[PDB]
Amino acid sequence: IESCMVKFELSSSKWHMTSPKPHCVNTTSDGKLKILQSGTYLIYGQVIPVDKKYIKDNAPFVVQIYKKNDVLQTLMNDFQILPIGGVYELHAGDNIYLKFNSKDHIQKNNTYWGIILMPDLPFIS
Amino acid sequence: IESCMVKFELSSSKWHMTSPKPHCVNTTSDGKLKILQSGTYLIYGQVIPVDKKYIKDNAPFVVQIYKKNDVLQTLMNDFQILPIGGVYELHAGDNIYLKFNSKDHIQKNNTYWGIILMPDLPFIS
């Protein structure tokens, strides 16, 4: 029943949390997390790219969400605002993290991500 | 306190909800929302496009989320699965809804969207 949500701010590398020690997730200062409670989660976030005029490298703008050692979601566009995630069934022990093609692509200010343990949605209408 | 989360499934045009009559929003059968409680919301979803190979013109795949008459975000990609949304401060009275560049671009099955009234995140680590 306990509400459980965390939000990692890339600007500060700090997690903002529902409680001092969220029951559903362990978080680390590298922006990674580990699911502690099996259940239905929203994985969410926005990856903000730098203006293309600043990009030095030849790499395309790609964001991957990993679950354990496998890719959960792959996202790409022409260096535009990039909401991430969706509703997933996760299990205790599942590590979740993001991988970027190039860290130089990412505007740290206002880039964030996280999860929320979702309540059941029993009522249809 | 009581969680408040709703999820619209485009396949069925049904909302799935945390409670019989959520306190934080009203919903419409067309997949629109009206915010009843001012607060911080997570807007989320995935918009599934029809395969590129079946779109025989140059019309782009674009999704916009609106708050009343204001564009909250504009998203586009090359006809790939499209996560939407993010954290937004909303106010009582705000209407939230999606608009598509072409309704014909949208696959109903597995397309969904919704909102969550977020818990406060006072603790930082």
Swiss-Prot record, chains A, B:
Record's bilayer topology term: Single-pass type II membrane protein
Instruction: Quote the tissue specificity entry.
Output: Detected in immature and mature dendritic cells and in macrophages (at protein level). Detected in spleen, lung, heart, thymus, monocytes, macrophages, B-cells and dendritic cells.
Q: What happens when the gene is disrupted?
A: Reduced levels of pro-inflammatory macrophages in the peritoneal cavity following injection with thioglycollate broth to induce peritonitis and reduced AGTR1 levels in spleen macrophages.
Q: Which UniProt keywords apply?
A: Adaptive immunity, Cell membrane, Cytokine, Disulfide bond, Glycoprotein, Immunity, Membrane, Signal-anchor, Transmembrane, Transmembrane helix
Induction description: Up-regulated by exposure to bacterial lipopolysaccharide (LPS).
- Provide the primary localization: membrane
Give the similarity note. Answer: Belongs to the tumor necrosis factor family.
**What name does UniProt use for this protein?**
Tumor necrosis factor ligand superfamily member 18
Its gene? Answer: Tnfsf18
